Design a protein around this nucleic acid. Structure first.
Length: 66
DNA sequence: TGCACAGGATGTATATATCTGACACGTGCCTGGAGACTAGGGAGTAATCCCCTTGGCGGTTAAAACGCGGGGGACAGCGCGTACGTGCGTTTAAGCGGTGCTAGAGCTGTCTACGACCAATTGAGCGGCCTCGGCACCGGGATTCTCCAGGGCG
């Protein structure tokens, strides 16, 4: 909540957030980040180890078109 | 006899007339520009009510935060060999110049189904409600499932 409000502070001052639509942002963030951890996990498996590394997130990130 | 020369017999860049390709300029028929009528869709206001805040004490709990052991897994070093990198000659086949066709692509009347536009009914679908049987959470108990210590075995 305080994070979304923090991001909304410097955009439009004195806004209001409904009781809904926050669980949609958090839900999409969680569901997307889990898939990102799966693709990054596979990227770490391609290097033949059990550890996720900072370069793995960049590999699995940029390789998705970002 | 050994030798230099005067001129023909071939090359070769050099300069001139010649062949595509693309920019530049002059039209006239389907576009735009513009003028007037209708009107319903957009700008503006009057309550409203309704969930959303204001400010901060305490008490307590569950979650967040820190701290150390070490175990295993990331990771550097190094030798091997076979799997492509590199280099030849030999072949099959695309590029391209040119040809005879056609069958499907492409612009144009007819009318005729056939869907756009508009009254009248209603009933099937939406706001409101209030229950109970499926659901939430956990005990009881059996079951599996992994962790650690010999020891019989190297």
């Amino acid at each position: 909540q305080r994070l979304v409000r923090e991001i909304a502070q410097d955009f439009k001052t004195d806004l209001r957030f409904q009781s809904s639509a926050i669980g949609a942002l958090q839900e999409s963030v969680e569901a997307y980040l889990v898939s990102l951890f799966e693709d990054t996990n596979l990227a770490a498996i391609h290097a033949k180890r059990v550890t996720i590394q900072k370069k793995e997130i960049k590999l699995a990130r940029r390789l998705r078109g970002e």
